[PDB]
Amino acid sequence: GAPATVTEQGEDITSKKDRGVLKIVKRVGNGEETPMIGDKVYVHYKGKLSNGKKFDSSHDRNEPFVFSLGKGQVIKAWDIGVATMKKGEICHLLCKPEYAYGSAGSLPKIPSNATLFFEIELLDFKG
Numbered sequence: 001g002a003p004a005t006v007t008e009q010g011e012d013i014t015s016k017k018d019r020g021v022l023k024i025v026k027r028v029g030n031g032e033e034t035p036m037i038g039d040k041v042y043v044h045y046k047g048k049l050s051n052g053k054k055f056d057s058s059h060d061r062n063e064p065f066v067f068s069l070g071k072g073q074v075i076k077a078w079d080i081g082v083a084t085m086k087k088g089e090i091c092h093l094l095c096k097p098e099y100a101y102g103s104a105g106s107l108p109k110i111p112s113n114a115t116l117f118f119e120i121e122l123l124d125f126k127g
């Protein structure tokens, strides 16, 4: 699947290089600029537990997902991953539990020790 493809071909984008967050660019974005800490970022995304038990999609809500980058408003994997995206880029991200919800998980959607997969499209950002 897409999860297995990211394991094989994904770039490790973690500081520690522990393969906790792996990225493949699926669509190349525009220009060179990437978002700064505190930038308001607008995305569409699809997400699922790697094994497949749960699925989530901003498209199904007809609403872009917005957050402030690098503030812990989202799982670490997103703060790391979205920082690397250009406007219009689409990437796939595989996220180990240590960059997501770890041992605790989150009731009721995320079990303990869950690896998460995401497709993310960066629509826009602004400081």
Ligand SMILES: COc1cc([C@@H](C(=O)N2CCCC[C@H]2C(=O)NC2(C(N)=O)CCCC2)C2CCCCC2)cc(OC)c1OC
Pocket (backbone or CB within 6 Å): 045, 047, 048, 049, 054, 055, 056, 065, 073, 074, 075, 078, 106, 109, 110, 116
């Ligand atoms: C743990 O709570 C949620 C998590 C998500 C998804 C999720 O993991 N996130 C939503 C998209 C941004 C990344 C990540 C996230 O940071 N979630 C939040 C968090 N942990 O602070 C920030 C927004 C919702 C909770 C998962 C849903 C199950 C399939 C895998 C992705 C969606 C959710 O609602 C649609 C959640 O409920 C608020």
